[PDB]
Each structure stands twice: as C-alpha cells, then as structure tokens.
Design an enzyme around this catalytic site. Structure first.
Site, PDB file in Angstrom:
ATOM      1  N   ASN A  46       0.878  -1.164  -0.042  1.00 55.42           N
ATOM      2  CA  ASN A  46      -0.046  -0.123   0.058  1.00 55.42           C
ATOM      3  C   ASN A  46       0.934   1.291  -0.112  1.00 55.42           C
ATOM      4  O   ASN A  46       2.207   1.001   0.238  1.00 55.42           O
ATOM      5  CB  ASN A  46      -0.934   0.020   1.180  1.00 55.42           C
ATOM      6  CG  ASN A  46      -1.946  -1.174   1.115  1.00 55.42           C
ATOM      7  OD1 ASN A  46      -1.888  -2.098   1.838  1.00 55.42           O
ATOM      8  ND2 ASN A  46      -3.033  -1.049  -0.007  1.00 55.42           N
ATOM      9  N   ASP A  48       0.930   3.654   2.079  1.00 59.87           N
ATOM     10  CA  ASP A  48       1.425   3.926   3.279  1.00 59.87           C
ATOM     11  C   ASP A  48       2.420   3.209   3.955  1.00 59.87           C
ATOM     12  O   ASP A  48       3.005   3.584   4.886  1.00 59.87           O
ATOM     13  CB  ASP A  48       0.129   3.937   4.219  1.00 59.87           C
ATOM     14  CG  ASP A  48      -0.424   2.764   4.741  1.00 59.87           C
ATOM     15  OD1 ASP A  48       0.257   1.674   3.899  1.00 59.87           O
ATOM     16  OD2 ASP A  48      -1.231   2.702   5.597  1.00 59.87           O
ATOM     17  N   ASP A  52      -0.876  -5.767   2.523  1.00 55.74           N
ATOM     18  CA  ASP A  52      -2.040  -6.663   2.741  1.00 55.74           C
ATOM     19  C   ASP A  52      -1.546  -8.226   2.159  1.00 55.74           C
ATOM     20  O   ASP A  52      -0.794  -8.130   1.278  1.00 55.74           O
ATOM     21  CB  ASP A  52      -3.002  -6.281   1.521  1.00 55.74           C
ATOM     22  CG  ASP A  52      -3.354  -4.934   1.889  1.00 55.74           C
ATOM     23  OD1 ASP A  52      -3.395  -4.385   3.054  1.00 55.74           O
ATOM     24  OD2 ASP A  52      -4.297  -4.368   1.022  1.00 55.74           O
ATOM     25  N   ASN A  59      -4.412  -6.418   6.402  1.00 53.13           N
ATOM     26  CA  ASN A  59      -3.297  -5.305   6.379  1.00 53.13           C
ATOM     27  C   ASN A  59      -2.397  -5.199   7.563  1.00 53.13           C
ATOM     28  O   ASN A  59      -2.838  -5.442   8.808  1.00 53.13           O
ATOM     29  CB  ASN A  59      -4.063  -3.996   6.010  1.00 53.13           C
ATOM     30  CG  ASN A  59      -3.077  -2.856   5.902  1.00 53.13           C
ATOM     31  OD1 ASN A  59      -2.758  -2.448   6.940  1.00 53.13           O
ATOM     32  ND2 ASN A  59      -2.483  -2.774   4.773  1.00 53.13           N
TER      33      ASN A  59
HETATM   34 NA    NA Z   1      -6.965  -4.872  -0.790  1.00 49.60          NA
END
Ligand code: NA
Ligand SMILES: [Cl-]
Ligand SMILES: [Cl-]
Ligand SMILES: [Cl-]
Ligand code: NA
Length: 129
Positions: A46, A48, A52, A59
């Site tokens: 991701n 950030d 995941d 996550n």
């Molecule tokens: Na996802």
C-alpha cells in the site's frame, strides 16, 4: 495455494464465516475473489507502506506483524506470513476480528466497491455445500 471458488466457499463455511456478523457466504467469496483471486500467497504493497496479505488481503497497519510497518499494531497476534498459508484458519480468525471492528465488510475496499449490493449469491452457485 490457489483455491477453486467452491473449494474456498466450503472452507470459509467450515470455519464459520457464513453469516458471520450477518454477512452471507457469497459476500466472503466475492471479497476473496477481488482481493486475492483466491490466491493465499497474494500480497499488495500500500501507499502508506503497509502490506496486505493472503486470501482476504489483511493489512499490516492493524492486524498482523511484518516488522516493516512503523507505528502499526498486531491485533490478530500473528506474523503476516501466516496469512499466506494454504490453510486459511489464520486468515479467517483474523477476518472475524476485522469485520467486527465497526464498519462491517466496508473494511475491505474491494468489497465495498465491487461486491456490496451485487448478486453475491452467484459466488456460491453450483457449490455442494
Ligand atoms: Na486490498
Ligand atoms: Cl451467499
Ligand atoms: Cl512493524
Ligand atoms: Cl454490518
Ligand atoms: Na503490524
């Protein structure tokens, strides 16, 4: 492991996801299809910096430990790598926590955008369950 559709449905059902927090089995199968294409080894970085993991793309910001998500928590008390196993038990245990966290299945963006409000029963069609 890449699950077949009905194969995943049966495993999710056995693990008690059917009707968990009121979400029928097809919701869960639909979410897994769009999250991981039913591949337990799926990963996604991701923006950030979290990742995941697994069948339901759980996550690392809140749910599992990967050692590389600063400030994150490990609410399922598991290494994220466990979410990649051919055995979906850890992913289910953890998904139960996630879906209980207040926003139901909206916690999976793929579910809100692609499954919510659709004919989710189609996901379990043909399955001998
Ligand atoms: Na996802
Ligand atoms: Cl269903
Ligand atoms: Cl971390
Ligand atoms: Cl809900
Ligand atoms: Na974490």
């Amino acid at each position: 492991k890449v699950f077949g559709r009905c194969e995943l449905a049966a495993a999710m059902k056995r693990h008690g996801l059917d009707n968990y927090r009121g979400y029928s089995l097809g919701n869960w199968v639909c979410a897994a299809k769009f999250e991981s294409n039913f591949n337990t080894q799926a990963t996604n970085r991701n923006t950030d910096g979290s990742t995941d993991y697994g069948i339901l793309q759980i996550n690392s910001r809140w749910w599992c430990n990967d050692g590389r998500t600063p400030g994150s928590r490990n609410l399922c008390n598991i290494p994220c790598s466990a979410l990649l196993s051919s055995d979906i038990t850890a992913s289910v245990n953890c998904a139960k926590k996630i879906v209980s966290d207040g926003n139901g299945m909206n916690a999976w963006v793929a579910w809100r955008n692609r499954c919510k409000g659709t004919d989710v029963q189609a996901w379990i069609r043909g399955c001998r369950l």
